[PDB]
Design a protein around this nucleic acid. Sequence first.
RNA 1: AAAUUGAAGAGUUUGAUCAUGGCUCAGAUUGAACGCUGGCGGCAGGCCUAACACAUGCAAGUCGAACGGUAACAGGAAGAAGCUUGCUUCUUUGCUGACGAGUGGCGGACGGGUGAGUAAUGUCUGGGAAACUGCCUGAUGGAGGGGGAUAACUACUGGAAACGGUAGCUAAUACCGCAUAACGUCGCAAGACCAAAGAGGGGUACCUUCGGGCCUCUUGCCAUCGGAUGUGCCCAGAUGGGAUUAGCUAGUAGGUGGGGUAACGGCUCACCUAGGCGACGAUCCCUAGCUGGUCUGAGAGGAUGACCAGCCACACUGGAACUGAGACACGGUCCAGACUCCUACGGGAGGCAGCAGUGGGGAAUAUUGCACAAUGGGCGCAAGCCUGAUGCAGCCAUGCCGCGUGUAUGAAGAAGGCCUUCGGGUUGUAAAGUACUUUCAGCGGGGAGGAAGGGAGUAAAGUUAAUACCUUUGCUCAUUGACGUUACCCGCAGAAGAAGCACCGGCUAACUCCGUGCCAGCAGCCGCGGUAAUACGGAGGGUGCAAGCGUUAAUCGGAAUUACUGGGCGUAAAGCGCACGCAGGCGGUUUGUUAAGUCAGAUGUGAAAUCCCCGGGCUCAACCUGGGAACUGCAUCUGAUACUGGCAA
Lengths: 82, 80, 205, 86
Amino acid sequence: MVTIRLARHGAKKRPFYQVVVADSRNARNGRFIERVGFFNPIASEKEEGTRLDLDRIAHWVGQGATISDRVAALIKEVNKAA
Amino acid sequence: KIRTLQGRVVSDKMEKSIVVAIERFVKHPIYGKFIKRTTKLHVHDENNECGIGDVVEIRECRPLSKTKSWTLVRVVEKAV
Amino acid sequence: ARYLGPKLKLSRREGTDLFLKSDVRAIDTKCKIEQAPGQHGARKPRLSDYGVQLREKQKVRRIYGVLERQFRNYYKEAARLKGNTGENLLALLEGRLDNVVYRMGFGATRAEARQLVSHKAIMVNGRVVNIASYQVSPNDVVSIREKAKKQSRVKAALELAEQREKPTWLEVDAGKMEGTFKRKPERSDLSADINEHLIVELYSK
Amino acid sequence: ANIKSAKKRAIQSEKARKHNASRRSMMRTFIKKVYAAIEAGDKAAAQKAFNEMQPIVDRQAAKGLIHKNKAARHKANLTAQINKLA
RNA sequence: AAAUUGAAGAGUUUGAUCAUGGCUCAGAUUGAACGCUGGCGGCAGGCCUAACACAUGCAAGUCGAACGGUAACAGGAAGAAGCUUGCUUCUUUGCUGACGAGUGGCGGACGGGUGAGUAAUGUCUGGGAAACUGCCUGAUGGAGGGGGAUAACUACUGGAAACGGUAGCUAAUACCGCAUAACGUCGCAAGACCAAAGAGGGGUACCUUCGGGCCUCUUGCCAUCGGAUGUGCCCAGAUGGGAUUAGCUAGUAGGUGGGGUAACGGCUCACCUAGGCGACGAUCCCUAGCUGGUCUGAGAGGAUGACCAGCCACACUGGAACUGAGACACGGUCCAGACUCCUACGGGAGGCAGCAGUGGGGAAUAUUGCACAAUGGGCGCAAGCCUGAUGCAGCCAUGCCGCGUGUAUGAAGAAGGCCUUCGGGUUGUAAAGUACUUUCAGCGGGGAGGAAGGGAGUAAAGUUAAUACCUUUGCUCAUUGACGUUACCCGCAGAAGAAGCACCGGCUAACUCCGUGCCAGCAGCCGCGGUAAUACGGAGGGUGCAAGCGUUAAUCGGAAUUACUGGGCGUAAAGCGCACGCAGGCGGUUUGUUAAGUCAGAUGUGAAAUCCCCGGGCUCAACCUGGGAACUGCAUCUGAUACUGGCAA
Ligand SMILES: [Mg+2]
Ligand SMILES: [Mg+2]
Ligand SMILES: [Mg+2]
Ligand SMILES: [Mg+2]
Ligand SMILES: [Mg+2]
Ligand SMILES: [Mg+2]
Ligand SMILES: [Mg+2]
Ligand SMILES: [Mg+2]
Ligand SMILES: [Mg+2]
Ligand SMILES: [Mg+2]
Ligand SMILES: [Mg+2]
Ligand SMILES: [Mg+2]
Ligand SMILES: [Mg+2]
Ligand SMILES: [Mg+2]
Ligand SMILES: [Mg+2]
Ligand SMILES: [Mg+2]
Ligand SMILES: [Mg+2]
Ligand SMILES: [Mg+2]
Ligand SMILES: [Mg+2]
Ligand SMILES: [Mg+2]
Ligand SMILES: [Mg+2]
Ligand SMILES: [Mg+2]
Ligand SMILES: [Mg+2]
Ligand SMILES: [Mg+2]
Ligand SMILES: [Mg+2]
Ligand SMILES: [Mg+2]
Ligand SMILES: [Mg+2]
Ligand SMILES: [Mg+2]
Ligand SMILES: [Mg+2]
Ligand SMILES: [Mg+2]
Ligand SMILES: [Mg+2]
Ligand SMILES: [Mg+2]
Ligand SMILES: [Mg+2]
Ligand SMILES: [Mg+2]
Ligand SMILES: [Mg+2]
Ligand SMILES: [Mg+2]
Ligand SMILES: [Mg+2]
Ligand SMILES: [Mg+2]
Ligand SMILES: [Mg+2]
Ligand SMILES: [Mg+2]
Ligand SMILES: [Mg+2]
Ligand SMILES: [Mg+2]
Ligand SMILES: [Mg+2]
Ligand SMILES: [Mg+2]
Ligand SMILES: [Mg+2]
């Protein structure tokens, strides 16, 4: 099952999630098919808190990839902000 | 349109098969002098039409025997 | 992590005034400036080229109060940066927050400026900065905080500040105790008896 | 085994093994019968055995005991030999 | 626009010189170890040796919306009673919320560990066809009607236990028929053949055996064709050392045919042919997991493969298959072996190279911790459950980065120490004294952010018979943090709680006195030491680093000292005793043609991280992060034709 999920790299107490499309069986911070944006929970409010290449996301979703709850929340929040 | 190699037949004593040597120039990795290298391939030759020394055109295909994975597309020049 | 010993000893070793004292008094009235420290100071050393290179590096280091590890990192960054390596090394050294505070005159010496910075007495863009090596950038506003602006030492230090030569690249308003770092200082505006190229050689020997 | 699911998996695997063995042996028996008919050279008897064998290999392939490719291969081989027989 | 800017030598052969030449040192780096010392914080890291043996506790479960059921607890219902008249009490009732055990579905093939094996069945790069693919997704249709069992349970019963054994009872989305069938399979066609499973929510009426039937929605099942993902397979190049290893190979090499696999294939057979590999190093031996990368280097290179990531292999040793979409399976099965352990001596159990931890080996590497709050993963409609993955904490100066250990003033140049040619000099503004500040630690008070969601109600839009149910979208409410007494901020006190290590003959920065007398001793090399030793030991002074400093080990450098970039061979080491000559290397000059090499352009690819450039965020930095450059390569296509090659003259 292809899934879109967050690969947390960040640093200790300072997470920086990377939205990646990957086979759900591979480890979290491991093999990924394609990266489609980033999310930084800590935000200076003048930086880009979340960047999403919605087009590629839609491409993979149409192909059949599922979406983690948090990635769906991010997509919905950015489309709502727009 | 089709990937292809060209070589000469060094031995044909096998039934329906031939071994062709593909020679190429490669710059030596360290010293630089362009040195000749040879690759010998067991090739499928229906009708055994290839004589030793002939220059033949070969293409890759599915595994046909334990070693044969190439088929003769055409003969280029024969019986030099 | 900081040199705490006697200061005029270093000036005596280097053979020149290093501004390690406030300046109110002529240094020759406070020490035998022209004689090396120690029992055998009077003898003169016929010093090798490696010796003179080391002495130049030590002179700059002791001027700015920077230890070898930090200075080595500074040299690496200056070499990485584009342009004249020695000149960007001097720019990096002169861009330290404590040095900027001393140039604007809030401290009689760089050590006093460093203590001012450390004790939450200096603001950069209205933000409390407590790290001595904070790099100040062009168009920055460095100000004394209101609570620490009533310290007697800073009002004393401003007189020494007005008595020494005024740097071109800083605009200091002493009344409000605030200043603007207009631009990075060039080589020509700072003292010309620093042979930075000796340091460039020393970190390439 | 130490894990609760491991014990049950072993039991289920033994049960499934016996069922699968029974059905697979049945299919192989029906195939060997047609092979013996071919080796006896009677087109009619081999065709009767083949047309009785055909519905069973397809059902076992559909039920997953063997692959559809295996069932089709068996059908192709037997048809080839029977047609090539006098 | 930027993606670089980049290279140091010295000592030592001699009476002295030049050269050759080895030895040594100055630089970085470490998964480091030891010695002296030691305040704080951020980030990262921590058995390299015995894949040696393992005590103990956790590391894989989940679903009552598949099913028979009720052991337990919570209800209710009946139900009599204590009697307070229903305040309780006993007894049934799976009738309800749920659920131990059991059947069944899915998941234990992922996540995690280690590098023994493997020199190519492996990896990297680039190609290819002869294949499969659970869950996910698009399309198209189906989803009919029966049947026989078996757990659970009960009864009997073997054994010490483990684990069983006989006889009855029940259910399904368990299992098996029969019907149905094409764009599915076989065939040239003709034809032949092939499958399925329900469950849940609500309900206007209507029928009803009162169970439901019936309508509707959601989810689930079967078939085919795709999509994506993953996996199996084939080819070429690349991928250590040894030639004091030169020959190896009979399923070996090829072919026909049969068998087997998801698939091609000596994969396996039967027969026939007698081949295949090798000096461009086959075979044999030794050694070793590979790669992105890391250290070093001006660069080419040399070494290396810890942490992060991709791939492979193994799971006490050897072997084997089964279930399954996927294993020949770390916490599955069977057998053999060595162990360890239980015993009734007949028989059995086990596998920390999972997380902690113990013993052992060693110079040397940590806590039997907290939580599922965040990210993922498994099951589930969901709530939720599980998770030693993960997030955090504990231990260690192991490394990198930051900060403090006070600031200013202060000559009577105090005392004391050391030196003194006895005048003085030096420690030294150093101290004391005199002013000022309170970073960090200490005490007290406030306080982010990591939190998205989920649950309840509402409203609207679907929905359909239905303002039910369910889905979506809002809105309203009370809530969800291991870290954690958090980061950060404010207040109090008082310079108050905080500096060591190596060296001082030259290389190499920094010198005297005393003791010692070729003794004790020092040393990286040269070298010191036999009576004034700047080289041994102590003191004073000084130099270099700094919460570290030194010593040892290992790699690169210096080493142009394996020299391709970049060396030599008359005498310093180095021209075979000489000639012929096969393979190999190179080849006069002109014309044509070829596009192999070569050059240009384009496309694809060169995983992400790392290095570099321009920026962004933690008060700075380390660190994290955005975009780009780069990844010098490989392959394909279209061009150029001078040079090299082929062919022709
Ligand atoms: Mg430091
Ligand atoms: Mg380790
Ligand atoms: Mg249960
Ligand atoms: Mg794994
Ligand atoms: Mg049925
Ligand atoms: Mg029954
Ligand atoms: Mg049928
Ligand atoms: Mg069925
Ligand atoms: Mg290697
Ligand atoms: Mg065959
Ligand atoms: Mg093969
Ligand atoms: Mg090994
Ligand atoms: Mg070099
Ligand atoms: Mg394996
Ligand atoms: Mg073991
Ligand atoms: Mg085994
Ligand atoms: Mg199977
Ligand atoms: Mg196994
Ligand atoms: Mg397993
Ligand atoms: Mg285990
Ligand atoms: Mg362990
Ligand atoms: Mg020991
Ligand atoms: Mg969790
Ligand atoms: Mg558990
Ligand atoms: Mg746990
Ligand atoms: Mg005195
Ligand atoms: Mg504090
Ligand atoms: Mg919060
Ligand atoms: Mg010297
Ligand atoms: Mg004596
Ligand atoms: Mg000594
Ligand atoms: Mg003496
Ligand atoms: Mg000594
Ligand atoms: Mg050493
Ligand atoms: Mg070299
Ligand atoms: Mg030489
Ligand atoms: Mg000689
Ligand atoms: Mg000669
Ligand atoms: Mg030639
Ligand atoms: Mg020519
Ligand atoms: Mg070409
Ligand atoms: Mg990359
Ligand atoms: Mg910044
Ligand atoms: Mg970045
Ligand atoms: Mg030519």
